[PDB]
Design a protein around this ligand. Structure first.
Ligand code: ATP
Ligand code: ATP
Ligand code: 211
Ligand code: 211
Ligand code: SR
Ligand code: SR
Ligand code: SR
Ligand code: SR
Ligand code: SR
Ligand code: SR
Ligand code: SR
Lengths: 360, 361
C-alpha cells in the first residue's frame, strides 16, 4: 500500500506520493464557478468566464464546499488515483480549530472513502524534513507567515506567532513600487508578470540602508527583465525593497513586528530552559522564505536581539519551498508510521473526533 | 555521509549500511586464539581444530571485552571494509544491558575506532519498528536466548520482559540428539554444521503436535531427504517438527520453563490492563529462531487458548525477520528526524562515556 501526501496551502496545493523526493503535482488552490466548477490551472486560464474563490485563507480552510472540489481535483485529475486505495496524509496550519480537523477527517472518510488518513502540522513536517524534531520554524507562504516553536515534535501553541503578510502581499507591493517607478502593473495578467519578476530577481539585502545607498549611486544592482511582448524593463532597488517588507511590515501599512521580531518574540514566550535549542535551530520553510540573502539577514537580526553569548543558527534548505510536503513524504513512508494512521474501522467506531486522540 | 548499522548477537554479527534493505555482512560472533594471535568469525570456525573458540556475547550481553573489540575490528576493517572515522555507527543492545556495558561500548567506539558519532538502540524496539509499529510485543528468539519485550508507544516495558533460556543453538543440539537416535553420527564441525543446515531448511512448527505425530507415523507424506557433500543421505520425518516443538515444550530438552506461547502470554499479562488489547493484536516475531514455517499459526492457536474469548489476536511474522533488528536499525539511522539524536564526538569529548545514558533510548 502506498500513501498520498497532500499539502494544502492558501495559494498552492502540493500533492504526491509518500516516499518521493518532491510532489508530483503543484497547482493553484483556486475554484472557479461561472460568472459547473473548475479547479487550478484551468480555473485560472478561464478567469474571464468565471468567479474565482480561494477555499483556504491564511492557511485555514474557510470554504468546505470548494475545498471538496480541490481534493476531488487533486485525486482524480492531478495524481490520477482512486482515493479509496490510499492512506492519505493531509497538512494543517498552526492553531487550526479543532472543528476543522474533524471536518477534514469526515470529508476524507465519508466523501472520498479513504482507507486511512492522518493530519499533521505543516511547520512540524518542515522541521522533520530539515533533520530535527526540536527547533523554531518560520513558515512563510502565499497568504500567511507563522513562527512555530517545536519541542520533540510538539508545537508549543502559546508561543505561536502569526503574521498576515506573505507572498501575495509582496507581489502586490512589487506591482505598486514598479508602478511608482513609472511602469504600469495593474491587471491580473500584469500581476502574473510581477510574480515572476519577484521569484526571479528579488533578494534580501544584508544591510538595507547601505543597499539603498548603493542603488542610488550606481546601476550595479540593476537587472533587466523581458516582458511577454518583448519590451525590456529595469528592476533596481525594487529587487530588495520588495522582501524588505517582511522585516518592515510598515512598508505595506502594517503596524506589525517583522519576521526577525516575531521569531525573537516567539522564542521569548517559550520556557527559558528550551530557548537555547530554539536559537540554535531556526528553520525556514515555504515559498516566501526563498529569497537569496534571507538566512544571512535573519542571522544578523536575531544576533542583534539575542543574548550576546547565544549560539544562533538559521537553517534554510535549498528545497524549502516544498519542505512541508517533503516532511509529509518522509513521515507517511516511514515504517513506524503505519500504526499511526486513523483507519476506516476506527472512524466508523468513533466518528471524526478520533482525530484529536490519533493526531496529537 | 552514510551511517553504519552493527547488530551484535550471541551467535551472529549482522552489519551493513543504513538505508540498505539487508545487512551486507553476516558472520559468527566467535573469536579463536591458538590452543596469528587471534581469528574472527568465518576464519576462526574453519581453523577451530587448532584454536580455542570463545563467544564474547552471552545471552545478548557482552562478557569478554578483549574479544568483543576484535569482533568490532573485524566488522569495520575486514567485512564492511570502511574507515570507522568516516561513519556514524548505530549499535544495538539486549534487554537490561548493564549501564557499565553501554558506557564501555561508547568509550571503545569513540576512543578505539574513532567514530564521528554513535548511538545504541534496543534490539526489540528496532524489530518492532521494522514491522511497522511502535506499540506491540516482540518475541525475539536468536542463537542463545529468547525474550518477550512488550513495547508501548516506542518504549520497552522492562517490568514485563520475559526470558526463555533456550534458542537456536539448543534446537540444533536437540535435532542432533534425535537424529543420532536414528543411527546418524555427527562428530566433526563439518557434520554438526550439517545439522544446522537441516534445521534451517527442513524443520517446521506443527499446528497440532499430537496430530502431526500421528500423520508422520501413518504415512511417508511428511518425509524429506538431505544429501551430504560426500554422497551420504539423511532422511527425516517427525524430527522436522519435534525440533522446533521444543520452543513450545522446553521439557523436550529437560527444562521446566514455560514455552514461547506462555512467556508471550505472561508478558502481556504483566502489562497494564488498558494496553493488553493492543499487545494481543500486535505480537511481532523477531530473530533467526522464529523463522520456522507454521510458527505464526501455532502461536495464534496457543495464545487464543490462553486469552479471553473475545480478544483479537494477531501474530506478525515478517519474511526477513531473521534480520529485523538490523533492518529497524537501517530505518532509524537513515531517518531525517534521527539526525540530531546521534552522540557526536564533540559531545563525548565534553561529557565522557556516561553521555550514552542521557542520549540513548
Ligand atoms: N523563488 C521564489 N522567491 C520568492 N518567492 C517565491 C519563490 N517561489 C515561490 N514564491 C512565492 O511563495 C508563495 C507560495 O509558497 P507556498 O506554496 O509555501 O505557499 P502556500 O502554502 O500556498 O501559502 P500559505 O502557506 O500562506 O497558506 C507565492 O507567493 C510565491 O510567489
Ligand atoms: N530459516 C531458519 N530456520 C530456523 N533457524 C534459523 C533460520 N535462520 C537462522 N536460524 C537460526 O537462528 C539463530 C541465529 O539467529 P539471530 O541472528 O537472531 O541470533 P543472535 O542475535 O546471534 O543471538 P541472540 O539473539 O540469542 O543473542 C541460529 O541458531 C540459526 O541457526
Ligand atoms: O522527538 C521525536 C518524537 N517524534 C517522533 C516522530 O518522528 C514525535 C513523537 O513525540
Ligand atoms: O510512538 C513512538 C514515536 N517514536 C518514538 C519516539 O522516541 C517513534 C519514531 O520513529
Ligand atoms: Sr503552506
Ligand atoms: Sr502545475
Ligand atoms: Sr456536501
Ligand atoms: Sr461514502
Ligand atoms: Sr539478537
Ligand atoms: Sr583515538
Ligand atoms: Sr495442546
Amino acid at each position: 500500500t502506498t500513501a498520498l501526501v497532500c499539502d494544502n496551502g492558501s495559494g498552492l496545493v502540493k500533492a504526491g506520493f509518500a516516499g518521493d523526493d518532491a510532489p508530483r503535482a503543484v497547482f493553484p488552490s483556486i475554484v472557479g464557478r461561472p460568472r459547473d466548477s473548475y479547479v487550478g490551472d484551468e480555473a485560472q486560464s478561464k478567469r474571464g468566464i468565471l468567479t474565482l474563490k480561494y477555499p483556504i485563507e491564511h492557511g485555514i480552510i474557510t470554504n468546505w464546499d470548494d475545498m471538496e472540489k480541490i481534493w476531488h481535483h487533486t485525486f482524480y485529475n492531478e495524481l490520477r488515483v482512486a482515493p479509496e486505495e490510499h492512506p492519505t496524509l493531509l497538512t494543517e496550519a498552526p492553531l487550526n480549530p479543532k472543528a476543522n480537523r474533524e471536518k477534514m477527517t469526515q470529508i476524507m472518510f465519508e466523501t472520498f472513502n479513504v482507507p486511512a488518513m492522518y493530519v499533521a502540522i505543516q511547520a512540524v513536517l518542515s522541521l522533520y524534513a530539515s533533520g530535527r524534531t526540536t527547533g523554531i520554524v518560520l513558515d512563510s507562504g502565499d497568504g500567511v507567515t507563522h513562527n512555530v516553536p517545536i519541542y520533540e515534535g510538539y508545537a508549543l501553541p502559546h508561543a505561536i506567532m502569526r503574521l498576515d503578510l506573505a507572498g501575495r502581499d509582496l507581489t502586490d507591493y512589487l506591482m505598486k513600487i514598479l508602478t511608482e517607478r513609472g511602469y504600469s502593473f495593474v491587471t491580473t495578467a500584469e500581476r502574473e508578470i510581477v510574480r515572476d519578476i519577484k521569484e526571479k530577481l528579488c533578494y534580501v539585502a544584508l544591510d538595507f540602508e547601505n543597499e539603498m545607498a548603493t542603488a542610488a549611486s550606481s546601476s550595479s544592482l540593476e537587472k533587466s527583465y523581458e516582458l511577454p511582448d518583448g519590451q525590456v524593463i529595469t528592476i533596481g532597488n525594487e529587487r530588495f525593497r520588495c522582501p524588505e517588507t517582511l522585516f518592515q511590515p510598515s512598508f505595506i501599512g502594517m503596524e506589525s513586528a517583522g519576521i526577525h521580531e516575531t521569531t525573537y518574540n516567539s522564542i521569548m514566550k517559550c520556557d527559558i530552559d528550551i530557548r537555547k535549542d530554539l536559537y540554535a535551530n531556526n528553520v525556514m520553510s515555504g515559498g516566501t522564505t526563498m529569497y537569496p540573502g534571507i538566512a544571512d539577514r535573519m542571522q544578523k537580526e536575531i544576533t542583534a536581539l539575542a543574548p550576546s553569548t547565544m549560539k544562533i543558527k538559521i537553517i534554510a534548505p535549498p528545497e524549502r519551498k516544498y519542505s512541508v510536503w517533503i516532511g509529509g513524504s518522509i513521515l507517511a513512508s516511514l515504517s513506524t508510521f503505519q500504526q499511526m494512521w486513523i483507519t476506516k474501522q476506527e472512524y466508523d467506531e468513533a466518528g471524526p473526533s478520533i482525530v484529536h486522540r490519533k493526531c496529537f
